[PDB]
UniProtKB/Swiss-Prot annotation:
Belongs to the cation transport ATPase (P-type) (TC 3.A.3) family. Type IIC subfamily. This is Sodium/potassium-transporting ATPase subunit alpha-1. ATP binds at residue 105. GO terms for molecular function: ADP binding; ankyrin binding; ATP binding; ATP hydrolysis activity; ATPase binding; P-type potassium transmembrane transporter activity; P-type sodium:potassium-exchanging transporter activity; phosphatase activity. GO terms for biological process: cardiac muscle contraction; cellular response to mechanical stimulus; cellular response to steroid hormone stimulus; energy coupled proton transmembrane transport, against electrochemical gradient; establishment or maintenance of transmembrane electrochemical gradient; heart contraction; intracellular potassium ion homeostasis; intracellular sodium ion homeostasis. Dephosphorylation by protein phosphatase 2A (PP2A) following increases in intracellular sodium, leading to increase catalytic activity. This is the catalytic component of the active enzyme, which catalyzes the hydrolysis of ATP coupled with the exchange of sodium and potassium ions across the plasma membrane. This action creates the electrochemical gradient of sodium and potassium ions, providing the energy for active transport of various nutrients. Could also be part of an osmosensory signaling pathway that senses body-fluid sodium levels and controls salt intake behavior as well as voluntary water intake to regulate sodium homeostasis. Expressed in the central nervous system, in most motor and sensory axons of the ventral and dorsal roots, as well as in the large motor neurons of the ventral horn (at protein level).
Amino acid sequence: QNPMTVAHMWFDNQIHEADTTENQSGVSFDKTSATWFALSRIAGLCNRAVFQANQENLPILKRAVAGDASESALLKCIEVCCGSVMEMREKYTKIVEIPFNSTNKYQLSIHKNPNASEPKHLLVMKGAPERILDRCSSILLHGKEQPLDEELKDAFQNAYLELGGLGERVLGFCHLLLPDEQFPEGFQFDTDEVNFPVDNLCFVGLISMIDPP
Ligand SMILES: Nc1ncnc2c1ncn2[C@@H]1O[C@H](COP(=O)(O)OP(=O)(O)OP(=O)(O)O)[C@@H](O)[C@H]1O
C-alpha cells in the first residue's frame, strides 16, 4: 500500500514526533548523525528484507520484497539514501552471528568495522524489545549514553506499548561499541568461546513504524 516510513521512533526517551510535517525533506532538521549513525549501521547489517537485488528503472517503494516474517519497512528507510545493504554485507567480514532458535528471542552479530568512529570490532543485537531490555541497562541520547533505570524502563515501556507490544511490531535494535586494545586482533569470539559482554551495553532505541496513513 502507498509509500510507508518509520514515523515513530524512540531515541529521545519521550518519542516527541520524528517526522517532518508539511513535506518530507531535511528542511531545517540537522544531520547530527550520532544515534542515527548507529541506527543506520545496525539497521543495515541486521536485516533480512531486501529489494530483490537492486532496481532497473523503478521506485524503491514498488520493487517487491524478499525477506522473512520480521519486516521490510525496517529497510525502506535505509536503501533510499542511507546506504547499500547489499554492499555492507561484504564490507563487514561477519565474525559470528548466534541464532535465536526459540529460547533466546534475541540475535547477535559481532562484526568488524573498518571505518567511521566505530571500533575495529563491535557487536549488534536485534530481538524482542523486552527480552533485550533484560540485559539492556543503558540508552543512547543524541550520541551520548544515559543509564537505564526503573524510570527509563517506564519511558521505554509506555513508548513501546503506544507503538505496539502485540507481537512482531516493535523491535529493539541495539549495539555495543567493543574495545580495540582490550579485545583480540584475531576476532576470536566464536559461539563457544564468546568472551564478549552481554550486559548493560547500549539500547540505541526503537525503529518502530506506522501502517495506517
Ligand atoms: N530476524 C529477526 N531477528 C530478531 N528477532 C526477530 C526476527 N524476526 C522475528 N524476530 C523475533 O522472533 C522471535 C520469536 O518469538 P515469536 O513470538 O515470534 O515466537 P513464535 O515461535 O512465533 O511463537 P508461537 O509458537 O506462539 O507462534 C521474537 O524474539 C521476535 O523478536
